[PDB]
Structure 1
Amino acid sequence: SRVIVHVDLDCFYAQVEMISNPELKDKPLGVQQKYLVVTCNYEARKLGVKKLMNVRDAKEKCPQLVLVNGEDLTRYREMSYKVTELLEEFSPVVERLGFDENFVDLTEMVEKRLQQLQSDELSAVTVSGHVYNNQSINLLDVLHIRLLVGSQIAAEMREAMYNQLGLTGCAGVASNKLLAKLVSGVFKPNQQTVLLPESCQHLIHSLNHIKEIPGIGYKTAKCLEALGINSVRDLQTFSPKILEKELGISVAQRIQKLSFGEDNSPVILSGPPQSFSEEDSFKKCSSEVEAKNKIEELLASLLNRVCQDGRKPHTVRLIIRRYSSEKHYGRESRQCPIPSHVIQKLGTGNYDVMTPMVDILMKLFRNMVNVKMPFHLTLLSVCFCNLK
């Protein structure tokens, strides 16, 4: 009964770099972080198997591949909220997912539009964009009409996004978040797709691995595998009772519903930010005692954000992880309710505030006792988080 739209922008970071420097346009571009080509424009994703997640390693394919550093997220973040606000203008309930994805619940909006339609030209409702599996529309099917109207809102949102902000992107319209997200990616470049109910199974079985299902990460994908479960149908037909008594009645019942294209999670209002953090890294270069000056830097930038945006962090930490072969995690981080007075004027010219963050950041850091001394580490972050 719900009409949800999932908006996913094209190579977001690359798009923000091109809009700020046309001389980069129509030129195989990739945005680089430390030693990572986080993403690149389409005129490169084909120009050398240059996809996301690769590094200078992928520069191999036509090294004429331009590069721009994308470590500072400031500009991406700002454009990201502009997209979200623009979307919130069409309808208030908008959920963010990373900096370039937005879920929008259009149910109420779609309905108001249909009501305003006389019982005469409601037979002229057409679709905007693609119909997922070239599925035939049935004008007398109330659910088809609502999703078509939904495709119309999507096209208006993408038009607005392009005309007002200069950004292109994809959109997917379906009856729930899972489906909307899966279908928004069927026609990748700058297009949109709507999913009619009769094609839900076709979309779900088009996936090659249960890992491709939104809501099934690296971990659970591993558990299921140990049970032989590899394909979407494997999960659809697996024994409920056993999966339940294997991952928990809560998770078991949820992930299995997803294998069928069922997902009742509501689109959540992703009102202002809940935490700010600035992490600066040195790729595994920490000696354990000579990192401290960096803390004075990365946390240095945060203040500028907090001061810019109101409200203050009544919390802090630093997050660290020791990585090796396989998986990542960490037992690094120290939090404390910062000083009342400091928290109330974190923009009145004081920088002595850093010393008190440094004492709790690292000298009051590590573990119980004094004994052995092994170092190793990989990049670390600090959170300015709970925010009230």
Structure 2
Amino acid sequence: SRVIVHVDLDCFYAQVEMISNPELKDKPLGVQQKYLVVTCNYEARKLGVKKLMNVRDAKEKCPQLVLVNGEDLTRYREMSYKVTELLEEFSPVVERLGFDENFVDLTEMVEKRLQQLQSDELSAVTVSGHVYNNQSINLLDVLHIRLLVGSQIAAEMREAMYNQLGLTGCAGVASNKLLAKLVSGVFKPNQQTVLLPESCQHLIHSLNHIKEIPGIGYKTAKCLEALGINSVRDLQTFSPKILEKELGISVAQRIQKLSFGEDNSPVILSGPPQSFSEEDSFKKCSSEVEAKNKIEELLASLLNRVCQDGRKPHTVRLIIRRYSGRESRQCPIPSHVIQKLNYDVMTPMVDILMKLFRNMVNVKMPFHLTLLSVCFCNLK
């Protein structure tokens, strides 16, 4: 019934770097964060470089790999919002997923375009891009026609993104978010594909690991592996009763639906972010004097970002990670502090954060943090 598109930018961070320094769009490029190559351009993947590879592995496997540092997300974040703002011009309800993916519900727009078409030009309606599984099109099938118009809009989207932002990316068009997202990566990079309904099963069964289904992550997949469940079909087939009584009703019914390619979740308007955070990770921080300096650094950046935003946060959170998950402490931001932008908001915010710090770190007893993070949320 619905016509949903999923847009997915090509090697996002690397693409941004290649644009900032066009002297790089010729070379294999990797974006580095500490010891990780979080992503690389397609010249690099040709040479054996994979996403999230160790710089050691990447170096050895590709000594001519140019590395740029991508620990500061400022520019990626800015381009990211330019992308969704551009998509919002097509339809106001755009849902972000991470920095480089967006869903848009095109069905109202598709409907509008059809109501305007004439008889002799419905003939006549064509696909833009790939048709998944080379499935043949039936122009008399109104579902095929709607999905085809979807593909046309999707191509207008990719064209605008290139023309206005210089950004290249993939699109997937299908009847729900799950399927749009699975199909958008079938032809990469910088291409698009549309999923006709009779090819839905082929798409879901094309997956080789149950983790490949968006919504099934490390923990959930590990549990399923424990239950003898490894293929999509194993999950499709497993006893709903037993599944429920091992993962709970909510998860069980949702992921089991997902395994059939069913996903009724609406595309949601993401809008402005609901939180701003900054982190730094390190081998060791073992003194409060360090912690405070670290935190002042993080807080400085955040205050810059809150500044531009316009809205004001009403709670602060401090996150740590002890040597060998994470722990957090939050509290509301005093009413008087919330009026800042010209004054000196630093010293009182660091005072609050340090109270939070000592609340979860015994400073009289040696400690070994390996991450510090500050988060502003409850924006108003």
Shorter-chain TM-score range: over 0.9
Match of 2:142 in 1: 142
Cα distance change of structure 1 residues 284 and 204 upon mapping to structure 2, 3 Å threshold: farther
Deviations 1:113-154 (A, max 9, x none): 111011221121110000010101111111111101000000
Counterpart position of 2:355: 363
CA deviation map 1:52-104 (0-9, x unaligned): 34324312123111111111111111110000010000111100011100000
Residues 248, 17 of structure 1: alpha-carbon distance in 2 compared, 3 angstrom cutoff:
same
Q: Tell me: CA distance 1:30–1:300, structure 2 relative to 1, closer, same or farther (3 Å).
A: same
* Structure 1: distance between partners of 2:282 and 2:75: 22
Bigger helix share: 2
CA distance in structure 2 between the partners assigned to 1:70 and 1:7 by the alignment: 22
- Rate the CA distance shift 1:157–1:243 in 2: closer, same or farther, 3 A: same
Change (3 A) 1:235 1:353: same
The equivalences for 1:125-140 within 5 A come to 125-140=125-140
Equivalent residues of 1:5, 1:172 under 8 A apart = yes
Residue 335 of structure 1 and its aligned partner are, at CA, apart by 2.1
Whole-angstrom distance in 1 between the partners of 2:322 and 2:74: 27
**2:81 alignment counterpart:** 81
* Contact persistence 2:330–2:356 (CA under 8 A): no
The Cα of 1:370 is off from its aligned counterpart by: 6.5
Q: Alignment partner of 2:31: what SS?
A: strand
1:185 aligns with 2:200: no
For 1:151-171, what per-residue CA distance to the aligned partner results, in whole angstroms no more than 9, with x for missing partners?
000000000000000000000
Aligned length, in residue pairs: 379
Q: CA distance change for structure 1 residues 307 and 371 in 2, over 3 Å: closer, same or farther?
A: closer
1:279 offset after TM fit, Å? 1.8
8 Å CA contact retained: 1:278, 1:383? yes
Preserved CA contact (<8 Å) 2:288 2:363: no
- 1:9-33 per-position Cα deviation (integer Å, ceiling 9, x unaligned): 0011111111111111110001111
What's the CA shift for 1:356? Answer: 2.3
Where does residue 98 of structure 1 map in the other structure?
98
Q: Deviations over 1:328-370 (max 9, x none)?
A: xx45333222222221223xxx564223222332344355896
- Per the TM alignment, residue 262 of structure 1 is displaced from its structure 2 partner at its CA by 0.4
C-alpha distance after superposition, 1:152-199 (max 9, x if no partner):
000000000000000000000000000000010001211001000111
Residues 132 and 194, structure 1, Cα contact 8 Å, conserved in 2: yes
On the 8 A contact 1:334/1:360 being kept in 2, the answer is no
Rate the CA distance shift 1:286–1:163 in 2: closer, same or farther, 3 A. farther
Q: CA deviation at 1:385?
A: 0.9
Q: Is the 8 A contact 1:286 1:378 kept in 2?
A: no
User: Contact between 2:318 and 2:356, CA under 8 Å: does it hold in 1?
Assistant: no
Moved more, 77-86 or 241-250: 241-250
Conservation of the 8 A alpha-carbon contact between 2:183 and 2:193: yes
What secondary structure sits across from 1:179 in the alignment?
helix
Structure 1 unaligned runs (5+)? 324-329
Aligned to 1:122: 122
User: Cα gap change, 1:93/1:369 in structure 2, threshold over 3 Å: closer, same or farther?
Assistant: closer
Gap change, CA 1:364 and 1:62, over 3 Å in 2: closer
Structure 1's 123 and 54: CA in aligned 2 closer, same or farther, altered over 3 A? farther
- Contiguous gaps of at least 5 residues in structure 2: none
Deviation at 1:230, TM superposition (A): 0.7
- Is the 1:161–1:168 Cα contact (8 Å) retained in structure 2? yes
Answer 1 or 2: which has greater strand percent.
2
Indicate how the Cα distance of structure 1 residues 263 and 368 shifts in structure 2: closer, same or farther if over 3 A, else same. closer
Task: Report which stretch shifted further, 265-274 or 363-372.
Answer: 363-372
TM-score (structure 1 length as normaliser): 0.93
**Alignment partners' CA distance in 1, 2:361 and 2:63:** 51
Q: Give, in whole Å, the separation in 2 of the partners of 1:306 and 1:228.
A: 48
2:322–2:370: 8 Å Cα contact kept in structure 1? yes
Q: Which moved more, 1:96-105 or 1:245-254?
A: 245-254
- TM normalised by structure 2 equals 0.95
Select between 27-36 and 282-291 the one with higher mean Cα deviation: 282-291
Instruction: Say whether the 8 Å CA contact 2:6–2:172 is kept in structure 1.
Output: yes
Question: In the alignment, is the contact (CA less than 8 A) between 1:215 and 1:255 conserved in 2?
Answer: yes
- Structure 1 residues 79 and 370: CA distance shift in structure 2, 3 A: closer
Deviates more, 1:243-252 or 1:131-140: 243-252
Q: 2: CA distance between counterparts of 1:266 and 1:379? A: 36
Q: Which moved more, 1:103-112 or 1:367-376?
A: 367-376
Deviations along 1:276-311, one digit per CA (max 9) or x if unpaired, are 112233244444553211111111011111111201
CA deviation digits over 1:214-246, x for unaligned, max 9? 110111111111111011000011011111122
- The aligned residue for residue 214 of structure 2 is 214
Is contact 1:335–1:360 with CA below 8 Å preserved after alignment?
no
Contact 2:286 2:366 in 1 (8 A): no
Q: Is residue 332–residue 366 contact of structure 1 (8 Å, CA) maintained in 2?
A: no
